[PDB]
């Protein structure tokens, strides 16, 4: 009934990014969000230097027009020191500091080297081939704005400025648990109607790889007191509490009333597949997300809803959701109009070098193999019907959580 | 002069994956490599269950052609163990264990309920709608083979079989250090032609993010005794030793002779760009990789050479190097024939939804901003010359190390 985009946007619009900060040495900031703007203490480059391998010259010596004998050279870490007579030029390489008085650099490929001097023939604009002090970064400028996620791309740049540590928004703390007498821990046998608890592990793993602080309270006993106690504890410790299965997502029972007793929680019916139910709302001091019991739905629902939410909450300002592309199906796809189907498929290059999706197989939610076999989602539009080999189709490549 | 592909195949052919293992609880196994095959101790599904929501019947009761009353119910968590008399049927839910003496299940769709029992609208064939124990995974089967890298796709499935821990290959240990009287740590001034050391950090961050155990020995003083001592230690405590800058990559000097003295190392000149020099070879108890001093070259060289080596080393059996696709340039690219140019670009969708690359800007190695601004490499062929807007071109999306 309710659309995914509508749901997501309503979740996101209620949420306020964290602000609490901590200062850490750069090596420990991977994945972390900047709490404050990084301001450059130095100029980059720190001095005027050559854009090219060629010769440093003065605009007047060129106008004179005689070949210019080489008076010396300026290199990597050894500027040209000493006098530079009129009627001469300085040999120079990329990155090397331009000598005092220099008005241009000429690339050697535009010149004729002879025993008695370099002959210049092309026009010589002033400033050409010269990289100005701080043209790349000026001291006092903001190199990286607050809200930036720190990666190998940013952190070395910060170190290049001589900064040892930066302040970052604190990890988001997420309490995790599941409930139900069916749920079984490993090592024990499966009594009557029991199954091993897989959703919790799945969520724990994704949470940790998303940079969060997990507080796994485990399986809570089929009991209202155990459950109220779990929520109280979870909500007091964390910014987000997750039920990975067992708490109500619509159906009326002892868990649904505790939920209605502890916060304002909405029970959604998403127009997606697989999945459908989703619980979301505010507890006393936290946000609550309750997932359906089916592994495939829990994962899907987590990945496409909780994951975005956690991002916003972290302080990250990177607007947009994982990238998608248009692609031809080498496979035939069973799709029902009514729901936004996130099928699994296999994106790979064909003989022509073009990219194409193949189904992983049976798209039913009774099996989890489609996450291993796959490598992307075939995001089939809500209103769309069956898909015939060769039709245009949306793929969302899996991110690192699945490979 | 020497091709990337050739160097890569030489490095990797000499290498021998680690075997040393350790058994860890599943929640600690993300990104880790399975040391032994995961063999299934149970059948999945564990019991002959129902595919649909409907009724468990027998063919002799359907044959009587009359409405058969509901003797009881069977849910997933509440298997039926009651009476099941002759002219009756059992209401069942999807995923639920089919009651003893079953033969088929029917959906509530091909069924209308009368006051005297359930009327059967359609036909009922022997074994319809019953999932049979072990049709997805048989007990004794190999679920995941040794060398598989454990992710959110695999790890929950392993918990579904009731396994708590699995054996994984030990992390690769990687020793890191740089050298030179020019390298400066943060907080200290830049003496004459001194610079802040960024390549070490860059590498540390990537190593950690690839799952390695980093031993960062910092900046070694410009002195053969400190260098020998660092090497003797790095080699004894790790599987790979990396100079991130400062050790020879060809130029003869005190560093090069300690290198030749401590193992068999080849100094290569790669036909790639940016970069070119790379040192690789065997020390006593380890593998050595020496990177060029230029930040862009050290990163690029690490990413394209050292990364695949670590992958092989780790035990991972995932044959291949990150994916590529053919794509049009919205940007003009300056390219010289002779070297394989790993330029940086911006892969994004256009108004028609198709994918396209744009340059990040200046491709020179005097700046690092191309890794942040970018999100992919434009892998321009060795023999290739300049590229015009709309030309077909190869792109290799950045992985997680760059965001």
PDB file of N, CA, C and O in Angstrom, chain A residues 74-105:
ATOM      1  N   UNK A  74      67.130  24.362 -12.313  1.00  0.00           N
ATOM      2  CA  UNK A  74      66.365  24.241 -11.071  1.00  0.00           C
ATOM      3  C   UNK A  74      65.590  22.929 -11.147  1.00  0.00           C
ATOM      4  O   UNK A  74      65.014  22.608 -12.182  1.00  0.00           O
ATOM      5  N   UNK A  75      65.605  22.152 -10.072  1.00  0.00           N
ATOM      6  CA  UNK A  75      65.112  20.770 -10.110  1.00  0.00           C
ATOM      7  C   UNK A  75      64.124  20.520  -8.977  1.00  0.00           C
ATOM      8  O   UNK A  75      63.562  21.451  -8.437  1.00  0.00           O
ATOM      9  N   UNK A  76      63.909  19.247  -8.650  1.00  0.00           N
ATOM     10  CA  UNK A  76      63.075  18.818  -7.530  1.00  0.00           C
ATOM     11  C   UNK A  76      63.421  19.590  -6.265  1.00  0.00           C
ATOM     12  O   UNK A  76      62.952  20.701  -6.083  1.00  0.00           O
ATOM     13  N   UNK A  77      64.252  19.027  -5.400  1.00  0.00           N
ATOM     14  CA  UNK A  77      64.586  19.677  -4.143  1.00  0.00           C
ATOM     15  C   UNK A  77      65.936  20.366  -4.217  1.00  0.00           C
ATOM     16  O   UNK A  77      66.832  20.110  -3.398  1.00  0.00           O
ATOM     17  N   UNK A  78      66.090  21.228  -5.215  1.00  0.00           N
ATOM     18  CA  UNK A  78      67.313  21.981  -5.364  1.00  0.00           C
ATOM     19  C   UNK A  78      67.075  23.104  -6.330  1.00  0.00           C
ATOM     20  O   UNK A  78      67.427  23.014  -7.499  1.00  0.00           O
ATOM     21  N   UNK A  79      66.441  24.160  -5.825  1.00  0.00           N
ATOM     22  CA  UNK A  79      66.251  25.396  -6.588  1.00  0.00           C
ATOM     23  C   UNK A  79      67.512  25.862  -7.311  1.00  0.00           C
ATOM     24  O   UNK A  79      68.600  25.394  -7.012  1.00  0.00           O
ATOM     25  N   UNK A  80      67.358  26.766  -8.272  1.00  0.00           N
ATOM     26  CA  UNK A  80      68.510  27.385  -8.858  1.00  0.00           C
ATOM     27  C   UNK A  80      68.915  28.544  -7.963  1.00  0.00           C
ATOM     28  O   UNK A  80      68.149  29.489  -7.787  1.00  0.00           O
ATOM     29  N   UNK A  81      70.113  28.447  -7.389  1.00  0.00           N
ATOM     30  CA  UNK A  81      70.716  29.532  -6.612  1.00  0.00           C
ATOM     31  C   UNK A  81      71.812  30.223  -7.440  1.00  0.00           C
ATOM     32  O   UNK A  81      72.372  29.642  -8.382  1.00  0.00           O
ATOM     33  N   UNK A  82      72.095  31.476  -7.097  1.00  0.00           N
ATOM     34  CA  UNK A  82      73.102  32.244  -7.804  1.00  0.00           C
ATOM     35  C   UNK A  82      72.514  33.100  -8.902  1.00  0.00           C
ATOM     36  O   UNK A  82      71.355  32.939  -9.271  1.00  0.00           O
ATOM     37  N   UNK A  83      73.341  34.000  -9.424  1.00  0.00           N
ATOM     38  CA  UNK A  83      72.926  34.993 -10.427  1.00  0.00           C
ATOM     39  C   UNK A  83      72.444  34.391 -11.753  1.00  0.00           C
ATOM     40  O   UNK A  83      72.887  33.316 -12.195  1.00  0.00           O
ATOM     41  N   UNK A  84      71.545  35.145 -12.375  1.00  0.00           N
ATOM     42  CA  UNK A  84      70.903  34.784 -13.615  1.00  0.00           C
ATOM     43  C   UNK A  84      71.124  35.967 -14.577  1.00  0.00           C
ATOM     44  O   UNK A  84      70.322  36.894 -14.571  1.00  0.00           O
ATOM     45  N   UNK A  85      72.233  35.995 -15.339  1.00  0.00           N
ATOM     46  CA  UNK A  85      72.491  37.108 -16.267  1.00  0.00           C
ATOM     47  C   UNK A  85      71.407  37.287 -17.298  1.00  0.00           C
ATOM     48  O   UNK A  85      70.707  36.329 -17.649  1.00  0.00           O
ATOM     49  N   UNK A  86      71.276  38.516 -17.783  1.00  0.00           N
ATOM     50  CA  UNK A  86      70.450  38.790 -18.956  1.00  0.00           C
ATOM     51  C   UNK A  86      70.922  37.934 -20.131  1.00  0.00           C
ATOM     52  O   UNK A  86      72.067  37.512 -20.198  1.00  0.00           O
ATOM     53  N   UNK A  87      70.016  37.662 -21.049  1.00  0.00           N
ATOM     54  CA  UNK A  87      70.356  36.949 -22.259  1.00  0.00           C
ATOM     55  C   UNK A  87      70.561  35.465 -22.040  1.00  0.00           C
ATOM     56  O   UNK A  87      71.112  34.818 -22.917  1.00  0.00           O
ATOM     57  N   UNK A  88      70.101  34.936 -20.901  1.00  0.00           N
ATOM     58  CA  UNK A  88      70.189  33.509 -20.577  1.00  0.00           C
ATOM     59  C   UNK A  88      68.892  32.946 -20.065  1.00  0.00           C
ATOM     60  O   UNK A  88      67.967  33.678 -19.716  1.00  0.00           O
ATOM     61  N   UNK A  89      68.841  31.619 -20.010  1.00  0.00           N
ATOM     62  CA  UNK A  89      67.674  30.881 -19.515  1.00  0.00           C
ATOM     63  C   UNK A  89      68.078  29.805 -18.512  1.00  0.00           C
ATOM     64  O   UNK A  89      69.224  29.370 -18.486  1.00  0.00           O
ATOM     65  N   UNK A  90      67.120  29.376 -17.699  1.00  0.00           N
ATOM     66  CA  UNK A  90      67.354  28.345 -16.689  1.00  0.00           C
ATOM     67  C   UNK A  90      66.613  27.056 -17.050  1.00  0.00           C
ATOM     68  O   UNK A  90      65.407  27.077 -17.229  1.00  0.00           O
ATOM     69  N   UNK A  91      67.353  25.955 -17.190  1.00  0.00           N
ATOM     70  CA  UNK A  91      66.791  24.627 -17.438  1.00  0.00           C
ATOM     71  C   UNK A  91      65.916  24.307 -16.246  1.00  0.00           C
ATOM     72  O   UNK A  91      66.287  24.654 -15.121  1.00  0.00           O
ATOM     73  N   UNK A  92      64.767  23.664 -16.458  1.00  0.00           N
ATOM     74  CA  UNK A  92      63.820  23.420 -15.342  1.00  0.00           C
ATOM     75  C   UNK A  92      62.878  22.258 -15.606  1.00  0.00           C
ATOM     76  O   UNK A  92      62.475  22.028 -16.756  1.00  0.00           O
ATOM     77  N   UNK A  93      62.515  21.549 -14.534  1.00  0.00           N
ATOM     78  CA  UNK A  93      61.583  20.420 -14.632  1.00  0.00           C
ATOM     79  C   UNK A  93      60.288  20.611 -13.863  1.00  0.00           C
ATOM     80  O   UNK A  93      60.171  21.470 -13.017  1.00  0.00           O
ATOM     81  N   UNK A  94      59.313  19.771 -14.174  1.00  0.00           N
ATOM     82  CA  UNK A  94      58.023  19.817 -13.514  1.00  0.00           C
ATOM     83  C   UNK A  94      58.193  19.843 -11.989  1.00  0.00           C
ATOM     84  O   UNK A  94      58.968  19.058 -11.420  1.00  0.00           O
ATOM     85  N   UNK A  95      57.475  20.743 -11.330  1.00  0.00           N
ATOM     86  CA  UNK A  95      57.476  20.801  -9.879  1.00  0.00           C
ATOM     87  C   UNK A  95      58.601  21.582  -9.248  1.00  0.00           C
ATOM     88  O   UNK A  95      58.510  21.911  -8.072  1.00  0.00           O
ATOM     89  N   UNK A  96      59.640  21.876 -10.025  1.00  0.00           N
ATOM     90  CA  UNK A  96      60.803  22.605  -9.560  1.00  0.00           C
ATOM     91  C   UNK A  96      60.500  24.078  -9.368  1.00  0.00           C
ATOM     92  O   UNK A  96      59.773  24.645 -10.165  1.00  0.00           O
ATOM     93  N   UNK A  97      61.104  24.724  -8.370  1.00  0.00           N
ATOM     94  CA  UNK A  97      60.818  26.145  -8.084  1.00  0.00           C
ATOM     95  C   UNK A  97      61.406  27.054  -9.120  1.00  0.00           C
ATOM     96  O   UNK A  97      62.577  26.913  -9.463  1.00  0.00           O
ATOM     97  N   UNK A  98      60.587  27.978  -9.613  1.00  0.00           N
ATOM     98  CA  UNK A  98      60.997  28.965 -10.625  1.00  0.00           C
ATOM     99  C   UNK A  98      62.004  29.939 -10.037  1.00  0.00           C
ATOM    100  O   UNK A  98      61.880  30.324  -8.890  1.00  0.00           O
ATOM    101  N   UNK A  99      63.011  30.324 -10.805  1.00  0.00           N
ATOM    102  CA  UNK A  99      64.025  31.216 -10.266  1.00  0.00           C
ATOM    103  C   UNK A  99      63.459  32.620 -10.160  1.00  0.00           C
ATOM    104  O   UNK A  99      62.507  32.996 -10.842  1.00  0.00           O
ATOM    105  N   UNK A 100      64.044  33.349  -9.219  1.00  0.00           N
ATOM    106  CA  UNK A 100      63.750  34.754  -8.893  1.00  0.00           C
ATOM    107  C   UNK A 100      63.756  35.620 -10.153  1.00  0.00           C
ATOM    108  O   UNK A 100      64.751  35.663 -10.872  1.00  0.00           O
ATOM    109  N   UNK A 101      62.631  36.272 -10.435  1.00  0.00           N
ATOM    110  CA  UNK A 101      62.491  37.096 -11.629  1.00  0.00           C
ATOM    111  C   UNK A 101      61.782  36.412 -12.786  1.00  0.00           C
ATOM    112  O   UNK A 101      61.422  37.061 -13.765  1.00  0.00           O
ATOM    113  N   UNK A 102      61.559  35.108 -12.692  1.00  0.00           N
ATOM    114  CA  UNK A 102      61.021  34.373 -13.823  1.00  0.00           C
ATOM    115  C   UNK A 102      59.614  34.840 -14.190  1.00  0.00           C
ATOM    116  O   UNK A 102      58.750  35.040 -13.332  1.00  0.00           O
ATOM    117  N   UNK A 103      59.384  34.995 -15.481  1.00  0.00           N
ATOM    118  CA  UNK A 103      58.082  35.435 -15.975  1.00  0.00           C
ATOM    119  C   UNK A 103      57.367  34.361 -16.792  1.00  0.00           C
ATOM    120  O   UNK A 103      56.169  34.482 -17.067  1.00  0.00           O
ATOM    121  N   UNK A 104      58.077  33.304 -17.176  1.00  0.00           N
ATOM    122  CA  UNK A 104      57.425  32.206 -17.908  1.00  0.00           C
ATOM    123  C   UNK A 104      58.245  30.945 -17.942  1.00  0.00           C
ATOM    124  O   UNK A 104      59.445  30.973 -17.730  1.00  0.00           O
ATOM    125  N   UNK A 105      57.569  29.836 -18.194  1.00  0.00           N
ATOM    126  CA  UNK A 105      58.236  28.586 -18.524  1.00  0.00           C
ATOM    127  C   UNK A 105      57.792  28.162 -19.943  1.00  0.00           C
ATOM    128  O   UNK A 105      56.617  28.295 -20.332  1.00  0.00           O
TER     129      UNK A 105
END
